[PDB]
Nucleic acid binder design. Sequence first.
RNA 1: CCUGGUGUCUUGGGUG
DNA 2: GGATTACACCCAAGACACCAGGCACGAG
DNA 3: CTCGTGCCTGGTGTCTTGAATCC
Lengths: 168, 518, 88, 58, 84, 262, 171, 35, 93
Amino acid sequence: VSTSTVGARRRRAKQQVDDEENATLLRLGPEFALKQYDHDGNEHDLIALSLSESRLLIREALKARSRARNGGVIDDDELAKVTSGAVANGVVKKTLDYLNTFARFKDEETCTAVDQLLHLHPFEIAQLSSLGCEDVDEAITLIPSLAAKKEVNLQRILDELNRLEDPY
Amino acid sequence: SQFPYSSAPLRSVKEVQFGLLSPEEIRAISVVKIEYPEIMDESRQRPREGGLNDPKLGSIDRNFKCQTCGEGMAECPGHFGHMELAKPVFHIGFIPKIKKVCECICMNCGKLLLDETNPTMAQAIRIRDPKKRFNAVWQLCKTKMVCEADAPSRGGCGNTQPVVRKDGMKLWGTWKKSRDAQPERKLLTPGEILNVFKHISPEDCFRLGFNEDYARPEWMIITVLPVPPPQVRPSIAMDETTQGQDDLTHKLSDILKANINVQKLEMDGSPQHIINEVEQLLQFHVATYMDNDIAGQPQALQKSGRPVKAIRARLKGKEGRLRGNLMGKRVDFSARTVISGDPNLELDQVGVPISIAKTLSYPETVTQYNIHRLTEYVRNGPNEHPGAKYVIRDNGDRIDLRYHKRAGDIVLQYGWKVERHLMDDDPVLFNRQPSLHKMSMMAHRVKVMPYSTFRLNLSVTSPYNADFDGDEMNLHVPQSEETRAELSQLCAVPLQIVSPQSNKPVMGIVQDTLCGVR
Amino acid sequence: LKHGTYEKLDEDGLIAPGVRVSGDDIIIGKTTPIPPYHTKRDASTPLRSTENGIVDQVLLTTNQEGLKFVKVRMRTTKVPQIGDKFAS
Amino acid sequence: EETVEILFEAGAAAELDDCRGVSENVMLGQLAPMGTGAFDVMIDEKLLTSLPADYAPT
Amino acid sequence: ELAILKEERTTTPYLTKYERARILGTRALQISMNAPVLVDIEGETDPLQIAMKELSQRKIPLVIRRYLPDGSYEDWGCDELIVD
Amino acid sequence: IWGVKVRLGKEKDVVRQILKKKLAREGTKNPLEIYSAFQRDSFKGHVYIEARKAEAINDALKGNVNVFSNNSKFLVGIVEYKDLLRPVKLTRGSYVRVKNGKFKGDLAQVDEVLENGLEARLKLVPRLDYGKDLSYTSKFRPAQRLFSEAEARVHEIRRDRDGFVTYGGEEYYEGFLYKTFRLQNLIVNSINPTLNELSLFDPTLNKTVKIRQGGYKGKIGIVKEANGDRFRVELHNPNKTIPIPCSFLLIESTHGWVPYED
Amino acid sequence: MFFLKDLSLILTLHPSYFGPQMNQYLREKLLTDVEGTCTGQFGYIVTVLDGMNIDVGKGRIIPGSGSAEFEVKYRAVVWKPFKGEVVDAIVSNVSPIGFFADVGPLNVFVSTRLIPDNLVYNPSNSPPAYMSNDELITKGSKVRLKVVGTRTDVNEIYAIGSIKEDFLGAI
Amino acid sequence: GVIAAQSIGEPATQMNVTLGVPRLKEILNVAKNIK
Amino acid sequence: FGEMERDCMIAHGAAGFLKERLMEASDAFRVHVCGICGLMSVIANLKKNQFECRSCKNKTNIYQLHIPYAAKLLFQELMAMNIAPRLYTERSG
RNA sequence: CCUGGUGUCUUGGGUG
DNA sequence: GGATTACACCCAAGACACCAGGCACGAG
DNA sequence: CTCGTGCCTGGTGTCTTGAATCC
Ligand SMILES: [Mg+2]
Ligand SMILES: [Zn+2]
Ligand SMILES: [Zn+2]
Ligand SMILES: [Zn+2]
């Protein structure tokens, strides 16, 4: 039905088992290669999004479109009624509410601070932001790929994440 | 539109990749293994599973749905089976190429007899066309009469190579054992050659002009036979309740019987000289199943005495699949009758008999501008002219106006189609055989007339090389809005008055009118 | 069964002389039983689709093998018209 | 000519047919790149915008 | 990429007989499926006639994509090509 | 031992002919110097001949019309001899497939064998009609169904024992036919049970019409099609079928041509 | 796991839709057909970016049928989960065979043989929960699980989790 | 292409050096030994 | 509609007419192909709306084609002689 | 109360 | 050694054999 | 009533030796 820029995938003589999606082994399949191409043929890094980025973009896109539907005229339950159809109403409401209960940095002030702090494979950089951690010991266990990289700063990463983190 | 809706995207064909079917792939697309030559269960209706008419292969009967795709016989394409061969046999089409490969490679390990160190040979691998490269290589290596263990180690085995000769369906290799001594030529069985071919390296596979993904060289030996569905070999009823089978059906039974007897040998009484007679016979049946015009040996015969119609003979010649059904074919919406002349018709008109005009039709789409006009045709029905034969809905269901007794209760919706009768000024393509040049096919405007001949204005007899001594001509009716416009704006008679053949007209005033005008 | 009319056959399965026939009309009714009621299959002969005329004469006899055997001759008249061919 | 031989030889050497000829497309029943088929026809979205607003798709 | 800019178009500015036939047929077809017609329809109500009327007034809303041998192409609108 | 190719089906004849030649020449100055000859059914189209010299093989076959004239004889190895002469089941309670008669192809249980050892009593699902059309072949037989003695009682029978009836001179015990077959008439090897065995074990059309108004007034015809109001009469007089309105017709009935009161 | 993907959809347009607001109809048409749908190749398509400004290109007319074919290139927010990815969740159901957890659009099933023995299902408690002493798994409790297998139905995808490992569970 | 083929073939169908159809045949068949 | 009538329509340049004659007005047939292996091996149940090329384990990359029935027949006869005619819908160079 | 299948392979004689 | 040898169309005129086994009928 | 012979049906399987040019 719907297709992408990546095409053909004609048969090759040697098979491959670096295709099976394994986040531990950095296998994201043929569609989510490290170097993608946009609809003009230009090269582009894979766009993986943390929970904090994603909350701003999706909410902005929905209210800008909602304003556009109103000729140019906050709460998650109100923002999800913009969609068309009960099937669409469901998936969008559940995604905001899920993000509403797990996004630490729920505003653009803190988020841009986290954005500048983080901006080396692009997938790992996005993983560190999504999974909250206390110490260096907790990060290399649950995410065993950070082992043999020999470039920490990790502690100051976690300290800034936890300091920017508002109380609850 | 005659096809029910399917969500799969519609695309056109841009490339045809030819190649060979691997043994593994044949099994992957097969839906059943074929073992028993008895077609019927026990002559008590319903054909035997695992037999040659196993219902998983498909339906050629209007009342049994396919047990694989659920579709009716019209839509169901048929699905292949497979038949395992007890012993690998040669493909009859590829023997002379197999023979060529033997003189190129080592008959022990299978490596190309020459390297890039040889200057002329290094030039030959650069040749871009695979066929010419393969021939250029073989032209060099032909005279190399021993596989060297050592460079001129290259991976060689040191053995001298035989001179392989073809003797019918058998290949003989004569090895020169190390002046002159005694050489012993033994038969090079398919199984022996099969194992040798699987050990050819990927790098030498490419240099031989073969292709690792599409045409791997051991796939020229047949180990499992694809069983075509019944659509390829339909049954026919000679005198209603008596049906004979297609030549392929009988021939596949013979291969299947012969396959069982090879299994019947290796487990008990094999006097060796019997194994060679039974294996060669399996090779024979598989060969004449594909090609029954093998030079130098008698043809396989039916019990009626006439030769078996092999697959190769199905495709060649004037009546075969290519020249008889694809480069040309029989077509709908055509008509033919004797022609007569009429001076009181315009140059671009053709007089069309009423009976022909009621049989042919054009599907005119219903719009706001013609809906009132088209309803009048519907009331008149198929037997009064000007009338109509069918009303086609957007779903495709046709209403046959011969049998619709409540014809007065039809209301037409926009977007429907009415197949109305042929009517005045419709363009049609007119044609007389033999079509020697482009003005053998010109578009004329219909004028419906009584009597059963086609009428032509006399000045068009010359480009058709027609006269009225018994000649017949053909009429073709375009079936859509796009082709009507193509006919009137490209092929119409007045556009054809001057021909590019000799930059001069091909029509003039002729016969009576020319005599009289002087 | 065939799509044409069977109403010109008499009870003996044969049409009688003097009856006009048109295309696809059945003129000889014959059945064949279906092997293993409602057991037979039609094997009848219709008049050629492009023709018409009058049944002129019907021969009934048996052949060398002793089964029944019929011939039906149809006559019509062809009147010259546009398109017919002539020669000195 | 040499119909079956061409096709056997084509298989054994894995020939690619790029479908640019007239004959290729005719036998596959596709619009051939010749005459009225030698180009594509696109819809002029720019010229449609000069129509009035009551003609608009909803 | 393949598209050639408007200022650098090199193919002939006259509508060919083949382009004309395809345009008339395609537009005719669309009208019979009840596409909005861009000219006044008086007495001439045949689909082909309406399409021929639109052509004569330079009002057919279609673009010719003329393929060149290498695969590149020049898009020409039927509004700008000169019809004899 | 040499093998020789012979016409299919003529192997026994060739063995016979060789024996006659051998016996006829015994003790003469030109004896046939072969020892034996034989033909194995499993080895179609071959005869084997025992001798010391190849010339004796040619001598044995000279003039034999069943032998292929090509110099096709082949030598057998000593290590292959005994296999040429290898001579090669059936137990009560086991299944076999019948090879002859209306029960051809049917699965049957072996009930018992004759004392002599030739025919075996088989237990079979019957194919009967209960004499329904009496005043059989394998192509015009009946479906299989267990014998029903009450159906036989009703429709057409001798009781012999508990659950045992003789019906039309065949024996049925607890619904099964018990019938003797030659052992050569059953298949005991490589039987494949089937799926089925696993489950078991308008009133004026075509009437003659006269036309009473119009240009065709007085002509005979037949109603070919009567969809509505407009009829299709196949006129007799010219070879044409016309469309005609219903007001214009007279229909034939018991008494003359009757208007639309029929 | 969220990504931004540049996608495209082939749209066929009937000729009766050839009016001055054609592009705006197509923009509405794209959104109705794509938003909220799932595919095994990309995951759930959550929202499309910059919907009212998408450049649809030119439509190819299909020979012989009159209808027009647009290739609408676009950019969307997509959500696909992955095997090996550790994620948080909100439990939707608790049953004798494990629990079901809503991670945004879909639901993940964790079976009993991959749950530690000390977490005991307690129906008598009010409200029902998986309980310990300093642990509390009620509906809405943050839990940390790891996706160990993805199965594809091409309509909705199904992922199976596990809490049979270190540092996974309630926090 | 096709126009060229028909333009040359059609006159041939109605038609001491060799001329007419036998000479035409030598050309297309580019025979090494002409008559 | 023989070989010589085919040539006349080419000379007229009436490509659209020639396509219709040899398809819609005759033996037009719809087939399904696998986008990966290019064979006509797709098993298509249209009322259940489920498609699968078992060889490629592919239920998503599948296309439909309109080709002559006699061409479909031709390819099945070629398959029966171990020739693989792979129909791809895109070029690659 | 809508759907609705009648053969093939040759050979010979003819038409333009 | 094979392959090449105009196009389309009409219509009338034809079809497995031999051997073995089983069943039925007639005669003793 | 039993045995033998003849006819019909079904199943399985081949073989005495006997138009011309071109590439
Ligand atoms: Mg003439
Ligand atoms: Zn099917
Ligand atoms: Zn070697
Ligand atoms: Zn595939």
